[PDB]
Symmetry: D2
Subunit: 299 residues, 4 copies
């Protein structure tokens, strides 16, 4: 079974989407008394109409996550923040006691920072501590390009690196549409426009609807689950703890990686030019900051 820690917006979006697919039984766990139990019941009535025979339940007891293959961490607090470090630190001791051999993917922001804290507090191998960054930035870039060029996003190959935030930088030179290089379809202006929209997409929604993304991370978690369950050997960009890769270590960054039934198998090093290594270094430093703002205890 797949456990979900959160029972909030992004947690329920994930639950809804995972019930639709029916990959496994799912468990909802949240601190607020009766909250997860109540949502599991409504979610169970939905599965009953859709005919999805998976078991769906909720609990306030963290020890119920005992025996989980994947533990999706979405329990952070949204936009309207690094107070999410404490909840990561508090959740870090629970899965360390009841899910020591599970893969954990963090949907809390700042994810690169949060992934750093979860990794250190769980004492889990880097391959089983996954931060959800790339898949979303990539799709968003696909979406803006497509809207502008008038083509499906299924035909856009968008490469991105850095971290999940202000300093996230897409790599056009390696992106294309239906085979055609991106830089050959759009002028430098048009490319810098799609990159603003992509970088500022998350803030924009918040600005519009009133609260930060939840369907995006949710739909990205579905892919991640499906990728682990099939032992697929897929390459997706995630926020992972670096140990030499891209020249850095003792830090977290958004990079391409092959995920499997046992987690991250290896980090891929894209061939970058001086500029792109400049821009990747800016990102590493950006994450540098957020971690330094954290109190030593959480480090």
């Amino acid at each position: 079974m797949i456990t979900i820690l959160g029972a909030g917006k992004v947690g329920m979006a994930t639950a809804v989407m995972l019930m639709m697919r029916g990959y496994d039984d799912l468990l909802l766990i949240a601190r607020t008394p009766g909250k997860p139990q109540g949502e599991a019941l409504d979610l169970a009535h939905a599965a009953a109409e859709l005919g999805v025979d998976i078991r769906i339940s909720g609990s306030n007891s963290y020890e119920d996550m005992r025996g989980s293959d994947i533990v999706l961490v979405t329990a952070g607090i949204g936009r309207k923040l690094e107070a999410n470090a404490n909840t990561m630190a508090d959740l870090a001791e629970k899965i360390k006691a009841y899910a020591k051999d599970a893969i954990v993917v963090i949907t809390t922001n700042p994810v690169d920072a949060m992934t750093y804290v979860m990794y250190k507090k769980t004492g889990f191998p880097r391959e089983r501590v996954i931060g959800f960054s790339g898949i979303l930035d990539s799709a968003r870039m696909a979406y803006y390009i497509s809207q502008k060029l008038g083509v499906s996003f299924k035909s856009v190959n968008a490469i991105v690196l850095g971290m999940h935030g202000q300093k996230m930088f897409p790599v056009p030179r390696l992106s294309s549409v239906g085979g055609v290089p991106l830089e050959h379809l759009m002028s430098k202006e048009e490319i810098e426009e799609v990159v603003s929209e992509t970088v500022n997409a998350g803030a924009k929604i918040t600005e519009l609807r009133g609260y930060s993304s939840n369907y995006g991370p949710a739909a990205g978690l579905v892919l991640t689950v499906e990728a682990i369950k099939r032992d697929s050997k897929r390459i997706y960009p995630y926020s992972l703890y670096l140990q030499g890769e891209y020249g850095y270590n003792d830090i977290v960054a958004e990079v391409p990686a092959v995920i499997g039934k046992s987690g991250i198998e290896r980090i891929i090093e894209l061939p970058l030019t001086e500029d792109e290594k400049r821009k990747f270094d800016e990102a590493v430093q950006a994450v540098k900051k957020l971690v330094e703002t954290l109190p030593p205890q959480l480090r």
Copy 2:
């Protein structure tokens, strides 16, 4: 395309599930500026990760719903903890009326499905205000009652709810009643597998199901309705001629008329084709008659303005 009027909690759950199935393009409309666009946007990014090629939009302009085959109404308000039954009815009735005028002007040929509660009363107001025929004004009630009934029977017998066939009728509320005589599990009549006290236990869980989750997570059901709309949409797009229980405006069926009730009906590409009349006993006929009185009582409790 499929238009969702709401941009709320049930409306957004419906949009999420509809995006999954990719049955068609879907357009979100709500009064609050930026709300529907903000959401449709998050959702579009989600379809981009899943590879679901459809269009998703959000608008504040009700004129953008023209050309819609199906209009899903979820705009109401939901019951809130420590809340007044009538303090919902009149509120949502006003919403329906207001929305009816929009549907009436921009989507004349569309099929409308309401989720707003009290569904029966809401379906009534919407039917009268739009000028649309019965066959195209659908209130969602029975599918969810049937699934919840099936779910509870399931938990109790240790079998898949997929193997349970539960028949329900009446209206969507206190007077909703099941027909155990016509129900079964894997081919076994329900009255054989369960005692009469056990059956009324599951009927309680079902009739009170909505209130239990509102008290637990703090707000009324939304996934159930949503999943219910997914089926309805698939049934129309496929012109399947499935039989599902819906709250419909009666014109003779079951010997009633000029009222709304939860009855079984054939659903197709152009709406309702015909209402099925289940063979009923003296007892069961009494229970249906009582269900009709509950809706009559709800309708009368509205202002002549909203009911005519």
Copy 3:
């Protein structure tokens, strides 16, 4: 992983359907050299076009099925003494490399085949499932709906007995939208649908030249999905009876709860005598099929 023993026309129709839903890695095993390999290969290219990262192989080596939790026997040739020998053969390979798995036979006559496979494998009664019921019900539901102009989804058809000539439906327990099937139909009409159902498989043979293959296949998808999800679902299957319905040591088509570990329990439907009589004939039809097999095969 799901192992398919056959590479024939149902087995190939099953692999395609099973590949589309992505449930698990599938494995094709067949005696003919090259055939399974070359089909897995085509099937894998189709999988790449659709985006299903499952793993698809082909093989002539039966030891490759070690570690399969489910074996789908689609080997038979669609006769009796032949498919009996094939069952006899394959039974030794399953017994040696897949003692832990749930085998589901599709080979016809399913009832008789399910008996040979049970006796020869030595497996427990709950893990030797014969495919038959799901299919009868779907056909009956199909014929009823073509006549009433409603979706077959909305039809609840109950069938019992055996997968053949004495397969009988129980209208008394069947329904459409909650309405008993007898308030909708007449004798005469309910007898046409039954006649249709009972002859459906032979009609498709006359019309296209080979015996049904998509029906069994689609039914295997459901069975696999039922097992993987441990759904506790109730489907009619050809199982070895140990007392249920007042018979023991014979295979018949009856309702059963299916889960992650095979058949959990057979459901005994409250039947009327005429129904009991119908059921008895069915049993007796299978005892005839079984007593034709040479002692060695049974």
Copy 4:
């Protein structure tokens, strides 16, 4: 409604996969009496077990294809091939032209580059609506062999191809990637030359082992084609299309990337080819040029 023309091996595989997806109603049309009916009956029974509500029919009367928005042609046999098939296409083309006047036709019959040519000529439909299936299967196979040599999902492989559906089929390394990493960087020239053999030899390999040419590759390809159209996705897939200027060629059919929508092909994409790439493309066009001329004028035009 979707109409399939054929009821064979690739016909039926398509029908099974389209049924699983449940995109729309199906119609099977084949010359042999009873074949499509019985096949549609077995398929319909399967649809009932899965609960897929669509309608599925069989028929020997081409009049029945009236109203389809998609017509799939799989009727081919698998120079003693070319002439037989071509005749087939011309016979089927007069039917489609009269009974599916508003239709998008997709050809799975081989050779396609030659068969699309005929169908185009004999139907008299605009270029938008006469699509030949070929690239989607070439790329997916090239993707497949790459994954198999790298040990990564083919979903993470972006293989580009051009030319035609046969020996002259040809991929483009410097535009193809894997996880965002350039194909040229991960594999040597030797290496890329090894996936290409495996590619161009696949069809022949599967016939040898399995005794009969590919069926699924095409069927699954037709599903993507059907989905792309039904959703008006504006997707980019390599198809065999009748050229009228693009790429500097005309009055010939070649495998090229195009945007496919609800009304057919919107536009053809013109890749930035080098001089060697261009030469290879010319060899492909030239292969088709002679493939068509091997046809009786009656059939070609």
